[PDB]
Design a protein around this ligand. Sequence first.
Ligand SMILES: [Mg+2]
Ligand SMILES: [Mg+2]
Lengths: 396, 396
Amino acid sequence: PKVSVLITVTGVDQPGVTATLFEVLSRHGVELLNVEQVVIRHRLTLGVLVCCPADVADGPALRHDVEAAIRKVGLDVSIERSDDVPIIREPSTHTIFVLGRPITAAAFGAVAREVAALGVNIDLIRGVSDYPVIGLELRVSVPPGADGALRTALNRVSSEEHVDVAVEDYTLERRAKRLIVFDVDSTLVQGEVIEMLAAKAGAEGQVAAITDAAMRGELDFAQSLQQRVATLAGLPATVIDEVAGQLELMPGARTTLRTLRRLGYACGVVSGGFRRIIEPLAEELMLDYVAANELEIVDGTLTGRVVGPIIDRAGKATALREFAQRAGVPMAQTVAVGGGANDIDMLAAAGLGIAFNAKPALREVADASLSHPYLDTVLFLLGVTRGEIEAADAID
Amino acid sequence: PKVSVLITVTGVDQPGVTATLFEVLSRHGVELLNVEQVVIRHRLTLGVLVCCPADVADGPALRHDVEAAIRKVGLDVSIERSDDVPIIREPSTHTIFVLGRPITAAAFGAVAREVAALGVNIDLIRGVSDYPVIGLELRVSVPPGADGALRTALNRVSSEEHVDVAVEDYTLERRAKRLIVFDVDSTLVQGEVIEMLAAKAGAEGQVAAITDAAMRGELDFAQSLQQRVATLAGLPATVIDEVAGQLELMPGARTTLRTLRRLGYACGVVSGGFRRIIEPLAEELMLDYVAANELEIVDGTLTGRVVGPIIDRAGKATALREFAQRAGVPMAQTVAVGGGANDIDMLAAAGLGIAFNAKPALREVADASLSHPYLDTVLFLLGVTRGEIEAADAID
Ligand SMILES: [Mg+2]
Ligand SMILES: [Mg+2]
């Protein structure tokens, strides 16, 4: 076959069309170069790019066989020479996630308009979830040196339209994510353990105020840790198990971890909280790595200090790096999820840094932000669909 | 928004259509439930499923705004109530690869016809490669308990039509493949080392005959190994480096391994050949695991025996299992690639067992078979496209 021909079938989806078309093409000298077919909402698009004998292409017979077969059953078909035509479309450079509850038309309109303004072509759109939130994906092709401007434009859109918008590299390498770390407090676990410990001392007031002050980045994490843990001076150490037994996982956490195990992720937690609370939990969740701070105890009583070294903002990044080196995972294939300014160095070190219901100081430097109280929306950012989760879980 | 509406735009692709449609929908009470959009060969299909106020849906205005905006620029659009309509399509159960050089229309026709006969619905078709061979993928939905019958039907088609046809589970878990092992001889490396050693003894004749006899499964691997290595009795051990330096990688091998590293695979070789030849090579290829047999040497001279234990057909499976346990990878997420009856137990132990230019005894039990002399066609079976390889390699 020395000449190329493109055949394009469109119309209301009926069964047997695919087989019929290729059964027809076999009565001509036809060899396949590319086939693309989808049905969206009962609309068939079937594009077939072939090579065929020069004398077959230059003859009405091939045309008449195809047009007869396809038009008969009710669909449309076009046939034309190619030769210059690209055989197989190029990969998308990036992918974009839009999560909302709801996603207004105006919101998605604003996204699609920012995309267009920056010469960014949309290659594919699909739904990735219908619960817990609506999730849409756009695989896009970004002009080189425009993706900074894109994330920026789309962040403005995200704030103004009340949806999450994440732009991610869609390269083979950068999208084989293999390792994830969570912060514990207000990320993997509901609320602040240190405030739960403080309530036992009748100090939740003092400590909640300082914690919000520290997670918004207004305070040095270490001095803030020292001032907060000091309020616990004199509590019996038995208070650690009490609080540990009062911890509720973030909605979607179990689903998030279970799905990450299916995908063969290394899973870890990096916290500024307390090891006696977190290790007992990390064992339960079957995690691969823990790093936390440690409460000082004397005669079964908390002294109000921690036992150095303190895991600070920098320490969190150092622990991610440590975890990644041990697991044999390059930094670009690592994921970090946090909610506080505590986590800023960690997120920026990771391949993908995800801010989860986060303070402004973190959202501003995070690769991606989530504003809904479901930790499994993290999974959508990692290329997983709700359907795929539900399917896999039903196999038990 | 209490009532659902489906909007479906089709026609010749023009820019700005996407943004335009959502800018129009925002003047109505529209919230998005699902968006699906693709362009194939300049055919736009844009399907939008929304919820909107009951009084907006029951009014001509929404219809007239949408129909006006879309028809004006040259495309078609339909609008209709939904309510019963599925929000987001279910995942495909399986995926099917068709590799050929060429892929005739008749071949693909035969595939699509077998698929249809077994109640199997086609969800998507796309090209995955234009070199070294033509590669097509069909994501399909298989009725439960029909995929045995499918692989069987498609194997008949594969033999008759001269294309490779592979059916694979498309579940989240089973498709997060994390570990691969290659056989060395006539798989990762061109030809048979043992025959190259034998040629040094003027025995390539005897040994080639026995090797073909063993790889076709007509011989016990161990007795065949003993008879073949015995022909080397008396060669200087220097002959090992000579042959090691004469080895050519299989076409596509470097590409295959490099791409597998990008994806973060654990990579290993499991051979019945000789460690002094393979270890030197596995170090060069930066592999994670080696298991081979070992030549006996006395005073710098080969004795013609191997030093037990012999890696036999069962040993290969045992080594895969060993490798997988160490790497922390479940058997279902493991891949094995071989060409001889030597490899039968290994392939069946692996999640996905790939026969590469293989003897009949292996093709008959392999999950998937490849008939073309390019080892990187393995990558297509692992969900990678040629475009994605080329893109990633150009980033260097
Ligand atoms: Mg936190
Ligand atoms: Mg072999």
